[PDB]
Design a protein around this motif. Structure first.
Motif, PDB file in Angstrom:
ATOM      1  N   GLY A  23       0.809  -1.234   0.000  1.00 37.88           N
ATOM      2  CA  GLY A  23       0.000   0.000   0.000  1.00 37.88           C
ATOM      3  C   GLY A  23       0.834   1.272   0.000  1.00 37.88           C
ATOM      4  N   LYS A  24       2.162   1.181   0.132  1.00 42.21           N
ATOM      5  CA  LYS A  24       3.065   2.356   0.277  1.00 42.21           C
ATOM      6  C   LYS A  24       3.889   2.553  -1.004  1.00 42.21           C
ATOM      7  N   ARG A  25       3.877   3.779  -1.544  1.00 46.44           N
ATOM      8  CA  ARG A  25       4.661   4.177  -2.744  1.00 46.44           C
ATOM      9  C   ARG A  25       6.033   4.678  -2.289  1.00 46.44           C
ATOM     10  N   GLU A  26       7.095   3.975  -2.699  1.00 41.96           N
ATOM     11  CA  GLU A  26       8.497   4.262  -2.304  1.00 41.96           C
ATOM     12  C   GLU A  26       9.275   4.726  -3.537  1.00 41.96           C
ATOM     13  N   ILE A  27      10.037   5.811  -3.393  1.00 43.24           N
ATOM     14  CA  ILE A  27      11.031   6.286  -4.398  1.00 43.24           C
ATOM     15  C   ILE A  27      12.415   5.826  -3.928  1.00 43.24           C
ATOM     16  N   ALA A  28      13.131   5.113  -4.794  1.00 40.18           N
ATOM     17  CA  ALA A  28      14.522   4.668  -4.575  1.00 40.18           C
ATOM     18  C   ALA A  28      15.357   5.189  -5.738  1.00 40.18           C
ATOM     19  N   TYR A  29      16.427   5.923  -5.442  1.00 38.96           N
ATOM     20  CA  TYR A  29      17.423   6.362  -6.446  1.00 38.96           C
ATOM     21  C   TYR A  29      18.465   5.247  -6.521  1.00 38.96           C
ATOM     22  N   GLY A  30      18.329   4.396  -7.531  1.00 38.01           N
ATOM     23  CA  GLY A  30      19.108   3.154  -7.657  1.00 38.01           C
ATOM     24  C   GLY A  30      19.476   2.886  -9.100  1.00 38.01           C
ATOM     25  N   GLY A  31      19.311   1.633  -9.527  1.00 41.61           N
ATOM     26  CA  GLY A  31      19.785   1.106 -10.818  1.00 41.61           C
ATOM     27  C   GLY A  31      20.829   0.030 -10.603  1.00 41.61           C
ATOM     28  N   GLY A  32      20.983  -0.877 -11.569  1.00 37.83           N
ATOM     29  CA  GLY A  32      22.015  -1.930 -11.532  1.00 37.83           C
ATOM     30  C   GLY A  32      23.380  -1.365 -11.178  1.00 37.83           C
ATOM     31  N   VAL A  33      23.782  -0.267 -11.832  1.00 36.31           N
ATOM     32  CA  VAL A  33      25.161   0.294 -11.700  1.00 36.31           C
ATOM     33  C   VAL A  33      25.334   0.838 -10.283  1.00 36.31           C
TER      34      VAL A  33
END
Ligand SMILES: [Mg+2]
Length: 278
Positions: free
Chosen positions: A17-27
């Protein structure tokens, strides 16, 4: 020294139910693992100048980053995956200033890293690897769908290591037997297959090496494959471990990363070392 080539991503996770923003990516996941494990690490990526500050933490973990300009940043929402926005593809020009013993191609979507850049990189570096995600996860009307890699038989022969998970392996082989998919994908010419699946890693070079993940947490899974690949590359390419030992090392690093969300942390090194490595 190792260079990771791939898009940083604005990851949108809707979980419980929670919308999370993650600044990520494989690299991001791979580069932080190699850097924290004490290998000089470089990232070549593309994003908007405005989004560069969201990925500052790469430099905080000792990663040298080339933030190449793009009119858009890659953004992926996750169950169905949607490519909300796509940064510009990598070019042969972007490979010009390639440095070190090893390059890992870690793309998020088919077309981010054109397959015909593989033979160009092959000539520039001693150890070349790629992540299957960047060749079998295809944008179709934003929806990222699994499609076979048509030119896999031409390009896999250029790779010292190819990373898959279960879904990627089955996309490439038509079987959900991960060991059998390792045999089939190596027959296409990739020297080493590293496969992650539920609670373990399988490495195949003609012989199988298996290690289990001994930890997991609600949000600990994302980036665990990228972490595992980077840990194996440090062990095998840079620390001169046997394929068997590198597999066990890779599983140990991944296990500690799977105890929490986001990339490997400096505080994870004590748990990883097990009073053996460092
Ligand atoms: Mg993966």
């Amino acid at each position: 020294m190792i260079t990771f080539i791939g898009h940083v991503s604005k990851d949108v996770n809707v979980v419980d139910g929670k919308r999370e923003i993650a600044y990520g990516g494989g690299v991001v996941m791979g580069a932080i693992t190699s850097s924290l494990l004490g290998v000089k690490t470089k990232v070549i990526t593309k994003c908007t100048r405005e989004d560069v500050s969201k990925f500052s933490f790469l430099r905080d973990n000792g990663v040298e980053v080339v933030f190449l300009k793009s009119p858009r940043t890659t953004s992926i929402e996750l169950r169905e995956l949607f490519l909300i926005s796509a940064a510009d593809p990598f070019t042969e020009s972007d490979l010009a200033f390639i440095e070190g013993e090893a390059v890992h191609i870690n793309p998020l979507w088919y077309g981010e890293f054109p397959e015909d850049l593989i033979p160009v990189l092959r000539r520039k570096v001693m150890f070349l690897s790629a992540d299957a995600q960047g060749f079998v996860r295809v944008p179709e009307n934003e929806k990222l769908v699994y499609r076979d890699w048509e030119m896999k038989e031409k390009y896999l022969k250029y790779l010292d290591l190819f990373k898959v998970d279960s879904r990627e392996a089955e996309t490439l082989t038509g079987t959900n037997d991960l060991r059998e998919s390792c045999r089939i994908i190596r027959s296409f010419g990739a020297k080493i297959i590293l496969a992650t699946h539920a609670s373990g890693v399988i490495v195949f070079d003609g012989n199988f090496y298996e290690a289990s993940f001994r930890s997991w947490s609600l949000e600990g899974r994302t980036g665990r494959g990228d972490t595992c690949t980077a840990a194996f590359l440090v062990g095998f390419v840079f620390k001169k471990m046997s394929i068997e030992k590198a597999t066990k090392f890779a599983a140990a690093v991944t296990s500690v990363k799977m105890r929490h969300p986001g990339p490997l942390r400096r505080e994870d090194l004590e748990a990883i070392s097990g009073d053996q490595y460092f």
